[PDB]
């Protein structure tokens, strides 16, 4: 629709590209195997919120009714853009920031915005990834350290916060890290945890020192292991009988929790996040294979599994959630089995989780006086399934408890954490690719000191900012990022693809591209959704952002080791000096889309 003066003469125009095939190997890397290409795309998409936020959002939207707004946005918006993602990087055969230069050169705020989101999410994930290794260092041993309480100072029973709450948590607010109360007070620096952060930066830098070459040989193992070990953990769940309890909690269809506005919203944010989008490394990934490679069914293949395996990941955790809730359901009851015979004294054989309550009626009938002194702790499954956690606690203060309900409890403590390490590490590649592909499109730096020297400039450049997360206050900074950083601005970066291909590039100009790559135009629903449907849905959920922008006041949790009714959290708001930086972390990636064009308009006027 737009004229674009100078639209062409920057693209390779469909008739010389067959000749560039036989000269690309001397200038650019290549996928040296068919099998090594599939290992890259699955590992960047999966995990890290599909494992902790997506199964949590099951039981906050209705368990057995959660799939319906969830599964559709696979087959309405994911399967367009990923097939669109494959088709242009194989067309232009060039980096992502170069793409929005070859289309309307008053653009290229977009290639920055892909880099300005990919660099921060690559930062604070490695903070989480370091704690995966930290608890893995704390593995290997007979009495796992979170299992027991530290004593008091008198060689007797335990300290107060390990008495008032479980030993799995206490080892988190002093052990994992020393904790602060608020976000406004920075405490200890956690210097040994800073060493654990430091080594986490290096196994990345070891593996992508030569970009496609070193990663292409180091993807054959890290992209198969996080799916196998998760297969025996499923039978481990049916080994310890604790399944069919959170499993039936996964099958609770709440039709009342479907017409909510945030039901479509929270489903829409995760399906955009379950795939790893708006980074541009996949443009370079689809530039390193053959030109006539079928990516149409490859768009069907890899999009299906990551939406299908994540459901199967949600099965294994609720078996554990059902397992932890199972034994805790009777622990208070066995205490009350003890508390019944405490004051009212039945023989220990003729008491069980049975007519216990009926014999309690005979106890109250024989005497009400001592019956008014025996307190009983009422318990219920869905009073033990009704507690939950999101973000971090599922593997750190929830999963490690049922780890300690195993006969080989230090051994499965090891096997849990290499799986989640390589899970984030495989997802730590395209955000790493999202910062180097616009970097090769900068070219104001000296072009000497080749890529291995440039590789050392990335890992030590972003080494520095993770230091504030090692503070006692540093965990409260991390709660900002999963909530705000990359929640809203991920959408409209993807929306600028829709305006470019239809009204600037021309969908019919894209139509002659697809008969070149594979041949004949695909099924007609492909051509429908690029016109209308993906432009429709992306702004409805963006409209739902303004519904949840300010309709609930911003509040973050504080721990307070000296808390009033201590075994619960405390939710306080932020100070006014904290409000000045919350717009910086999520807003400045969105400012560059008009922002460079204003600099470009005063540069060319």
């Amino acid at each position: 629709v737009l004229p674009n003066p100078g639209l062409d003469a920057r693209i390779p125009s469909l008739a010389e590209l067959e000749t560039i095939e036989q000269e690309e190997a001397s200038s650019r890397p290549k996928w040296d195997n068919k099998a090594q290409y599939m290992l890259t795309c699955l590992g960047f998409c999966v995990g890290l919120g599909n494992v902790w936020r997506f199964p949590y959002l099951c039981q906050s939207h209705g368990g057995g009714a959660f799939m319906i707004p969830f599964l559709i946005l696979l087959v309405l918006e994911g399967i367009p853009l990923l097939y669109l993602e494959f088709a242009i990087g194989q067309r232009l055969r060039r980096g992502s920031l170069g793409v929005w230069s070859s289309i309307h050169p008053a653009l290229k705020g977009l290639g920055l915005a892909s880099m300005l989101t990919s660099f921060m999410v690559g930062l604070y994930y490695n903070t989480i990834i370091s704690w995966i290794m930290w608890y893995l260092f704390n593995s290997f041993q007979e009495p796992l350290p979170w299992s027991d309480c530290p004593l008091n100072e008198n060689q007797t029973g335990y300290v107060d916060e390990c008495a008032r709450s479980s030993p799995v948590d206490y080892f988190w607010y002093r052990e994992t890290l020393n904790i602060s109360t608020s976000i406004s007070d920075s405490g200890s620096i956690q210097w040994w945890m800073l060493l654990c952060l430091a080594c986490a930066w290096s196994v990345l830098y070891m593996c992508t020192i030569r970009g496609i070459e070193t990663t292409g040989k180091a993807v054959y193992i890290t992209s198969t292991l996080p799916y196998v070990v998760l297969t025996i953990f499923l039978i481990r769940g049916l080994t310890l009988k604790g399944a069919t309890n959170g499993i039936v909690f996964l099958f609770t269809p709440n039709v009342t929790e479907l017409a909510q506005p945030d039901t479509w919203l929270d489903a829409g944010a995760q399906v955009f996040f379950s795939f790893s989008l708006a980074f541009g490394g996949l443009i370079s990934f689809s530039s390193y294979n053959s030109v006539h490679n079928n990516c149409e069914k490859d768009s069907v293949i890899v999009s299906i599994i990551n939406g299908f395996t994540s459901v199967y990941v949600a099965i294994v955790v609720y078996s554990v959630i059902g397992f932890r809730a199972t034994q805790r359901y009777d622990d208070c009851f066995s205490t009350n089995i003890l508390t019944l015979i405490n004051g009212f004294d039945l023989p220990e054989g003729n008491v069980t989780q049975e007519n216990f309550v009926d014999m309690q009626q005979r106890c109250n009938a024989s005497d009400p006086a001592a019956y008014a002194q025996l307190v009983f702790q009422t318990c219920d499954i869905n009073a033990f399934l009704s507690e939950a956690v999101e973000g971090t606690g599922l593997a750190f203060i929830v999963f490690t408890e049922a780890i300690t309900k195993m006969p080989l409890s230090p051994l499965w403590s090891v096997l849990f954490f290499i799986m989640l390490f390589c899970l984030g590490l495989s997802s730590m590649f395209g955000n790493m690719e999202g910062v180097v592909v616009p970097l090769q499109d900068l070219r104001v730096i000296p072009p000497k000191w080749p890529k291995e020297v440039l590789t050392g400039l990335i890992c030590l450049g972003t080494f520095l900012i993770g230091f504030i997360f090692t503070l006692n206050s540093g965990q409260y900074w991390l709660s900002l990022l999963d909530s705000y950083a990359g929640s809203i601005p991920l959408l409209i970066i993807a929306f600028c693809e829709m305006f470019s291909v239809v009204y600037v590039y021309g969908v019919d100009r894209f139509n002659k591209d697809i008969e070149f790559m594979i041949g004949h135009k695909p099924n007609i629903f492909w051509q429908v959704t690029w016109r209308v449907v993906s432009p429709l849905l992306m702004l409805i959920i963006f409209l739902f952002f303004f519904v949840v922008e300010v309709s609930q006041e911003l509040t973050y949790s504080i721990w307070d080791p000296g808390y009033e009714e201590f075994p619960k959290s405390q939710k306080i708001s932020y100070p006014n000096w904290v409000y000045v930086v919350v717009v910086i972390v999520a807003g400045v990636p969105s400012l560059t889309i008009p922002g460079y064009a204003i600099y470009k308009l005063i540069r060319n006027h």
């Binding site: 930290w134 260092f137 290997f140 080594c199 196994v203 830098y205 070891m206 020192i209 070193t214 291995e452």
Partner: peptide, 30 residues
């Protein structure tokens, strides 16, 4: 002294040598 620094001590030695192995390959492929 510490058990978590024992398992930390072996993985910090793995990290130092693999980066210079690929340095020798890139210098042999100049």
């Amino acid at each position: 002294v510490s058990i978590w620094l024992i398992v930390f001590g072996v993985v910090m030695g793995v990290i130092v040598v693999g980066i210079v192995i690929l340095i020798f390959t890139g210098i042999r492929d100049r």
